[PDB]
């Protein structure tokens, strides 16, 4: 049996509240939803 | 940062004439060994030729390294680093790219 808390935020969180209510432990969440990205640029060959 | 110099395996160039020079020195050394055996040369003499042939070969190669870089590959990373004064010494390079 476990209890969980969920949040929406940006970036990453340092586990600042080491002091805690009994039985509660924090985890450093990373809230970034995009794993990777790339882009490329090429010529349309339209002359002038 | 913008130019971004880096060093790779094939940027460590060696003078074009090394193979010919090492191959010839090795021939001279074999011939002298056959002759020590047959009685035509003494031992102090064998010792001397061996130290001397090898020092000349190494030294000529060092001398010729800079001309090769300045004439054939001016912008190589190894040259830029040494000529600039940034890091490296001719002796240190000789060891990476010569003998």
């Amino acid at each position: 049996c476990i209890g969980l808390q969920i949040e929406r935020n940006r970036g990453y969180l340092i586990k600042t509240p080491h002091n805690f209510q009994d039985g509660s432990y924090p985890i450093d969440a990373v809230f970034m939803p995009v794993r990777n990205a790339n882009h490329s640029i090429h010529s349309y060959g339209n002359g002038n | 940062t913008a130019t971004s110099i880096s060093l790779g395996i094939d940027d460590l160039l060696t003078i074009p004439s090394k193979g010919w020079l090492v191959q010839d020195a090795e021939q001279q050394s074999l011939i002298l060994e056959k002759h020590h055996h047959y009685g035509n040369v003494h031992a102090v003499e064998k010792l001397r030729q061996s130290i001397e042939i090898w020092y000349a070969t190494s030294e000529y190669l060092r001398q010729e390294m800079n001309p090769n870089f300045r004439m054939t590959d001016p912008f190589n990373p190894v040259h830029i680093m040494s000529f600039s004064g940034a890091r490296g010494n001719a002796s240190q390079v000789h060891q990476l790219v010569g003998m």
Binding site: - | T3, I5, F75, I80, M81, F83, S84, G85, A86
Partner: protein, 32 residues
């Protein structure tokens, strides 16, 4: 830092390196 200064002042290819064929048979920007 020295590497950067050298690169800025190093220069450009002058003759055979910049043109394949003799310039005889046949730079441009001018700035104020």
């Amino acid at each position: 830092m020295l590497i950067g200064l050298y690169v800025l002042t190093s220069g450009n290819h002058r003759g055979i390196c910049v043109n394949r064929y003799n310039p005889c048979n046949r730079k441009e920007p001018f700035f104020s």
